[PDB]
Symmetry: C2
């Protein structure tokens, strides 16, 4: 998968350029979102482009969260979806991230949830992942996209915040469809997918 667009506030830029461990959490997020491949036998992520809204997006989020959890030791649910916690220079630091699979109103609620966590000092950096419009077009109906929330990234200024817009590497009607729903893929299937991603 590719990171095609990215928005980083000035405060996140300063924080990344001076905090190694925060820079690391961010690197792990970028890697977990670039790593998905499809089909599982492949080394690129190709999305089936037969019709609008034909693919699910939840399986992608589950895969992403699983890599962070299993490979990178991130925790799930703080109610921030996933976060990394660690001591650095005698201080506990937390990074929070959410992968948006809901509609635009959902994305607003998610952004504000992180913004409040930041204001209260519960997290030191917030990251949101969203598919860009081009990809979202072939993803399930509900799902919002990076460009739709973009006019509002400005509301995070003054706080360490990063928005990442991902895209598939290719679009073809010759690969299978990604299943829809929370149960689109079992944990056994996500873990098998994760292994292929990691060559195991």
């Amino acid at each position: 998968m590719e990171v095609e667009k990215e928005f980083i506030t000035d405060e996140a830029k300063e924080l990344l350029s001076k905090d190694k461990l925060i820079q690391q959490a961010y690197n792990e997020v970028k890697t977990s979102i670039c790593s998905p491949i499809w089909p599982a036998t492949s080394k690129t992520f190709t999305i089936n482009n037969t019709e609008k809204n034909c693919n699910g997006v939840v399986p992608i989020k589950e895969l992403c969260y699983t890599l962070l959890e299993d490979t990178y030791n991130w925790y799930r649910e703080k109610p921030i979806d996933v976060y990394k916690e660690f001591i650095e220079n005698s201080e506990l630091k937390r990074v929070g991230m959410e992968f948006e699979t809901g509609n635009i109103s959902s994305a607003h609620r998610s952004m504000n949830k992180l913004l409040l966590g930041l204001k209260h000092g519960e997290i030191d950096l917030a990251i949101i992942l969203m598919p860009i419009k081009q990809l979202a077009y072939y993803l399930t109906d509900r799902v919002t996209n990076f460009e739709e929330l973009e006019p509002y990234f400005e509301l995070t200024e003054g706080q360490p915040f990063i928005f990442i817009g991902f895209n598939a590497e290719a679009y073809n009607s010759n690969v299978p469809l990604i299943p829809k729903g929370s149960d689109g893929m079992s944990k056994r299937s996500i873990k098998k997918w994760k292994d292929k991603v990691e060559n195991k």
Copy 2:
């Protein structure tokens, strides 16, 4: 109807205490939300309390917006629901307001929409109206409430923002139910209701 809870940022407080015409727009909003009465023959607002979620809320919003429009010369749709525009000391000033009838995610999107309008200088003050939890309990299923959005009022600090939580004056199972939906009441019915509210 009663204004039972209210949140005003420090910046709204300063602005109200030094800008007469903004103070006036605010007074007109408070009056339009206190004015609803039910049934139409009554002088208080009594809400039917037979079951949870039995009453509609959209008719109340339509009535409120109609008083502001017809009696107070506010405009509808700028896409801020209603706003008042006026020249004061050789400057164009705008006040924007939204009456929340959607769910909590909706309320977040609405708050952010106003927050961005404020940052860009498109409006000078933002106001949001929401029913308090006690009332919301007897309102339609979708509708969010003041207390649910409350933890987030803090995100508006630094900007002129006001949140108003309204309540019915009485709860009784002997009055009729307020119809649900956008078409719950025709414009003829809302205007007839408005006249009773205004004694005409």
